[PDB]
Write a protein that binds this ligand. Sequence first.
Ligand code: PYI
Ligand code: PYI
Ligand code: AMP
Ligand code: MG
Ligand code: MG
Lengths: 255, 243
Amino acid sequence: HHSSGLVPRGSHMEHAFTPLEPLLPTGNLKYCLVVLNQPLDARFRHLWKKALLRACADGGANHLYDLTEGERESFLPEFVSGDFDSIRPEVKEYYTKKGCDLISTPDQDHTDFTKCLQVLQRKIEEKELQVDVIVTLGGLGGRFDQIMASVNTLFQATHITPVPIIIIQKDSLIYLLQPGKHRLHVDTGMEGSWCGLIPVGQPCNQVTTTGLKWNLTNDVLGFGTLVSTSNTYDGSGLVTVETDHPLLWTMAIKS
Amino acid sequence: MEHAFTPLEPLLPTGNLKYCLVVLNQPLDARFRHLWKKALLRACADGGANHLYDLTEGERESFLPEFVSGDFDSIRPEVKEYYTKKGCDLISTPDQDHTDFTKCLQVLQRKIEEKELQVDVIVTLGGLGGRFDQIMASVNTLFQATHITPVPIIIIQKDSLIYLLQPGKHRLHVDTGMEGSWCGLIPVGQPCNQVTTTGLKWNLTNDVLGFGTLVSTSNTYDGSGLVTVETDHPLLWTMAIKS
Ligand SMILES: Cc1ncc(C[n+]2cccc(CCOP(=O)(O)OP(=O)(O)O)c2C)c(N)n1
Ligand SMILES: Cc1ncc(C[n+]2cccc(CCOP(=O)(O)OP(=O)(O)O)c2C)c(N)n1
Ligand SMILES: Nc1ncnc2c1ncn2[C@@H]1O[C@H](COP(=O)(O)O)[C@@H](O)[C@H]1O
Ligand SMILES: [Mg+2]
Ligand SMILES: [Mg+2]
């Protein structure tokens, strides 16, 4: 203001995110990996390799243990948290003898996924390291109530860690967009054909987007009113979203 | 004043329950056969026909839909042919603002009034797995369904069932013996600020259910065989189906 010479004016911060980047072979993101109790998709090995930290939520360990025979010492979690109402005795044993940190989380008011994030967040600050994103595998298939629980974890996550969290399983990815403006880069080449915007918690009364086939212009998104599913990209390679309330972004993963 | 309902009833080998069956584009669970046999009317939404067709090979004439609606961008030509040849009514629904599931219910409701048929419930198979944006669409269809037909609609796939509870009081009978161990109340859409329940391990007493505040998942039954729910806004009921 009071300075002289050219001076940038106008400007509002925007959240610039690239969803499926962790799925890119090369690149150097810096992310943590969380394995939930669900069948592991083949992309897990590559994701594990470059992850800064890996962990498993209860049953998640069973799935990891069973899909890494002959090379399990190459897939040793930094820690396995949960309540152990899912991990098999022998699996709990193996990881404990190899040095894995087994953390018990009894709380019956919260899922192991949520509790696992709490442990992860703590290990993050406690190890003075920071991540650009937390990649969660599984949680979108199987039991319906659990799928919803996963979505609800993304809500609580805002109070657990400042690091963005994405959930991936089979051909889907979800990411909760907090109120404000977002710039999502969907030009990694790993993108599928569909995408969508789900009002999960409450109606989003003012949504505006760009880069979609069916864009919103200060529109209302709400169950029973209008939910964007089976939407697609305009080809620009960029999607911007502005929402007044938490809005769930979902997109397809190639192949 | 209230609606007495029994969710997993169609799954019972016994009964006179009059219901219609809708097959969505997802792999059919084994329960399919029995459900089809006693259905008053069967239909398929686009791709649903492919899964029906590939499942009933060798005996497709015993499993002929009464109509297949959609937009035919999933139904394989050979499949589309077969059913047209056997007399199945193929109805096109191009509307790209509505899923083939919602549009299928529209066709169904029409057929119901049209045939002066009386149905207790509409059983939908599939729609809870696969593409995430798909599962949500299914949930969204249940919201729109309230303006498409007065007949209760349930969706089932694998081990899950969902049913949208409209504002008011509900009495759910969960003593068919087909019930699984878990159940839940999901406030999709909007926060339900006044929820009161009975028959659950974790009941609610004029409590608030909303994402980020409190969502009831992994809940269970108290063994009474009855669950009652009073809600101020649409509340999604979900429950497990035995092994
Ligand atoms: C209100 C209410 N509701 C319900 C409940 C229950 N819950 C919740 C959350 C969480 C939990 C735990 C579990 O998780 P897991 O680990 O996953 O197990 P599963 O069954 O799922 O397998 C619970 C119990 C409460 N609390 N509240
Ligand atoms: C806003 C908005 N967003 C999105 C869109 C799109 N959409 C929606 C709904 C529905 C549809 C159709 C789809 O269904 P399907 O056919 O079943 O799927 P696929 O896979 O077959 O393709 C759409 C497109 C709008 N419109 N708006
Ligand atoms: N059927 C399922 N569908 C989706 N996520 C699941 C399912 N079962 C378990 N999970 C997730 O995996 C985490 C730990 O698994 P578990 O303790 O074995 O139930 C939970 O906190 C959930 O977030
Ligand atoms: Mg557990
Ligand atoms: Mg279609």
